[PDB]
């Protein structure tokens, strides 16, 4: 349905182009830039425009209505982004009220490990109800990226128009408990600089979850219910549906399931 301006979703990422056409009238906020992988998508336009479109623009968003927060990872966007960079991108949208944090990035890990920095700045998350969303990562394995393996994340694995998962998608076994399919394959979104094209990644399918997210808060707010980003992570974890068949691609591939936004909002309502 509709999102909410009470309902804040934080694009954590590289540079955004606000200017782009679609954000004419999105509520965005973007805070000031301080003193195979990466954290920064390369995206950060795109990105946030599956979000944040707006309905008769260009690229129509999933929760136009709901308020954004443009928080900037880097001081300098040539320069390698670090976990350190990207904790204090957590702490300040959690400290500015975010609901739901999409990092579309990450960092390609041997079993999920992280430095102490950003295991703190998840938990912080995990403290604060905050709803963490993180891209799975494009190396085709049984792999895990950092954001997206960590406690309490939701991490987001792509799939194709036909609902089956993508070659590239990392299946890891921490994504079977805590990772959702969601679409990935040439997704619309602006570009900077003005126009749109589509592009497929674990980057776009990432910002479709928050979206959905997002929406779901939304509903959690005009039924007189207090938000609670955590639920909605367990709601998208419990409704998605398998994976058709394992003949032809595999049962680990599927992660917890395909995301299913019918079903999430069936169970939002505590319904069967």
């Known amino acids: 349905l509709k999102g909410d301006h009470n309902i804040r979703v934080a694009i954590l990422d590289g540079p955004v182009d606000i200017a782009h056409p679609c954000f004419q009238g999105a509520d965005l906020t973007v805070l000031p830039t301080l003193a195979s992988d990466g954290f920064m998508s390369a995206h950060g336009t795109h990105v946030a425009s599956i979000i944040f479109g707006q309905p008769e623009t260009s690229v129509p968003g999933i929760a136009p209505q709901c308020r954004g927060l443009i928080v900037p990872i880097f001081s300098d966007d040539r320069r390698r ?10 702490e300040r949208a959690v400290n500015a009220g975010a609901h739901i944090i999409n990092i579309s990035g990450g960092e390609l890990t041997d079993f999920g490990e992280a430095d102490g920095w950003l295991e703190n700045a998840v938990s912080l998350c995990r403290q604060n109800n905050v709803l963490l969303v993180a891209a799975a ?41 805590q990772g959702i399919l969601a679409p990935g394959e040439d997704i619309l979104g602006a570009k900077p600089g003005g126009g749109t094209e589509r592009l497929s990644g674990t980057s776009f399918a990432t910002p479709i979850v928050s979206g959905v997210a997002a929406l779901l808060l939304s509903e959690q707010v005009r039924r ?44 939002l309502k505590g319904g069967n």
């Open 81 to 90: 982004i670090t976990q350190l960079d990207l904790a204090r991108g957590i």
């Open 137 to 177: 990562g494009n190396n085709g394995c049984d792999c895990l990226h950092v954001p997206a393996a960590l406690p309490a994340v939701l991490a987001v694995g792509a799939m194709d128009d036909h609902g089956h998962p993508l070659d590239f998608s990392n299946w890891g076994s921490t994504y079977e408990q």
């Open 224 to 267: 007189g219910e207090t938000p609670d980003p955590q639920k909605v992570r367990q709601l998208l974890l419990q409704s998605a549906l398998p994976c058709d068949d394992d003949a032809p691609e595999q049962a680990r591939r599927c992660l917890a399931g395909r995301l299913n936004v019918s079903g999430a909002f069936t169970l």
